Amino acid sequence: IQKTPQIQVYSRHPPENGKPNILNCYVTQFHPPHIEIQMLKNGKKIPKVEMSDMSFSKDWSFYILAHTEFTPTETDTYACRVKHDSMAEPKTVYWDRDM
Amino acid sequence: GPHSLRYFVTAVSRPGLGEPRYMEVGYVDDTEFVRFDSDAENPRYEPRARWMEQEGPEYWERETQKAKGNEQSFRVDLRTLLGYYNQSKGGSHTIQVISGCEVGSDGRLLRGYQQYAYDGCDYIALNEDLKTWTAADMAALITKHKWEQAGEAERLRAYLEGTCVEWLRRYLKNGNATLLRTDSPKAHVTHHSRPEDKVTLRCWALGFYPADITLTWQLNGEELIQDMELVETRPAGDGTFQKWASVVVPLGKEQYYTCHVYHQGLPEPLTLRW
Amino acid sequence: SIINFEKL
Fold first, then answer.
1. Alpha carbons A83 and B14: distance in angstroms, whole number
2. How far from chain centre, in Å, is Cα B27?
3. Which domains does chain A have, with CATH numbers?
4. Rounded Cα–Cα distance for residues A7 and A11 (Å)
5. What's the superkingdom here (chain C)?
């Protein structure tokens, strides 16, 4: 079976510019388990990215969380890019702090 | 309240690209606490919780060797399955297993599980009785016979009611301060504009534990379920969870809607208005 | 502690 990932980008706390926070990219409901996930700070790749909270749902779909510590700025734009066999080209999801 | 020890196992082949990747991830309730990744630099069982550092060298070495044993065992299973299914050696394949036990407040096993899947589909699973197996297809029937002939359900019944339950007790003991805590959620409503003089009210619940929570929007009494959008509760990177539920309402009339947060960490449920 | 698995 093959399922397309749902990608959700969000922070641990409500963003306060200049204040420390955790940016998470929760990729879910995908299959096969082969996947590449990158978190980008203004188009450039972030190094300090942790992989955690892996699990399967009732229907066996994979769930995985990518997260990093970050300090939001009014001008910096953050995003999460996912490459997976179920997609033609990599999908990029942007962090929308005004959500 | 009840508690559980679950392990998510994955074996995924990579024909041509190398050896299969094997992973074992463990959870006590909603907390990840152990992991084994064969693609790691130095494949050892690692603690994913601060409290597991209380466990010494014998534990880590014992678990590491066991993980390596399972790894080698799944490499044999992957090939075996190609045959049961008449599959070519080229494709990549995945075997998943959920294994664990839930015990109630009194300490009696509420539920024990051992279920398998191949390529995202149910393959075989131990039944409620912890004595019989349910095979999902023609191929699974072969494993079922091999397992009946081996008295595998007995072996599992022993693990589930014995070992699983004892270790869960040791874990809850070693990490009670973390595992038995309760973080009440902090909620807030965000406003959002949109076409046709409509607005998006989004109720946010943040920093709570355990993961179970209930968020509902109400039109002064009625819970608007059908006309409410919401995400699956999700981990926030530091051991807590978050969630949100939104509802689109006519502009100027937002003050007739209330959000209600239900969670075990609260004396009374929360009620919020924009 | 996770169980040691049997072959399919």
1. 17
2. 7
3. 1-99 (2.60.40.10)
4. 14
5. Eukaryota
Inter-chain touch B152–C1, beta carbons under 8 Å: no
Our CA-based measurement puts residue B119 at a distance from the nearest CA of chain A, in whole angstroms, of: 6
Q: Is B188 exposed, middle or buried (0-12, 13-18, 19+ CB in 10 A)?
A: middle
Q: Which residues of A touch B78 (CB under 8 A)?
A: none
**Contact by Cβ (8 Å): B147, B133:** yes
Listed residue (B226, B225, B222, B201) closest to B214, CA to CA: B225
Resolution (A): 2.5
Does chain A touch chain C (at least 3 C-beta pairs within 8 Å)? no
Place of tokens 């409901």: A29
- Write down the number of H helices and E strands in chain C: 0, 0
Residue B268: both structure tokens together: 């009374």
Q: What are phi and psi of B81, to 5 degrees?
A: -60, -35
Query: What domains are there in chain B, each with its CATH number?
Result: 1-181 (3.30.500.10), 182-274 (2.60.40.10)
d(CA B62, CA B66): 6
| Partner-chain contact A13 B206, CB within 8 Å | yes
- The coordinates were experimentally obtained by X-ray
Q: Tell me whether residues B66 and C1 touch, CB distance under 8 A.
A: yes
Burial B148-176 (b: 16+ CB within 10 A, else e): eeeebbeebbebbbeebbebbeebbebbe
- Determine which of B238, B240, B246 to mutate to test the interface with A (most A C-beta atoms within 10 Å): B238
Which residue of C2, C5, C8 is in closest CB contact with B26?
C2
Over the range B20-34, which residues count as b (16 or more CB within 10 Å of their CB) and which as e? Answer: bbbbbbbbbbbbbbb
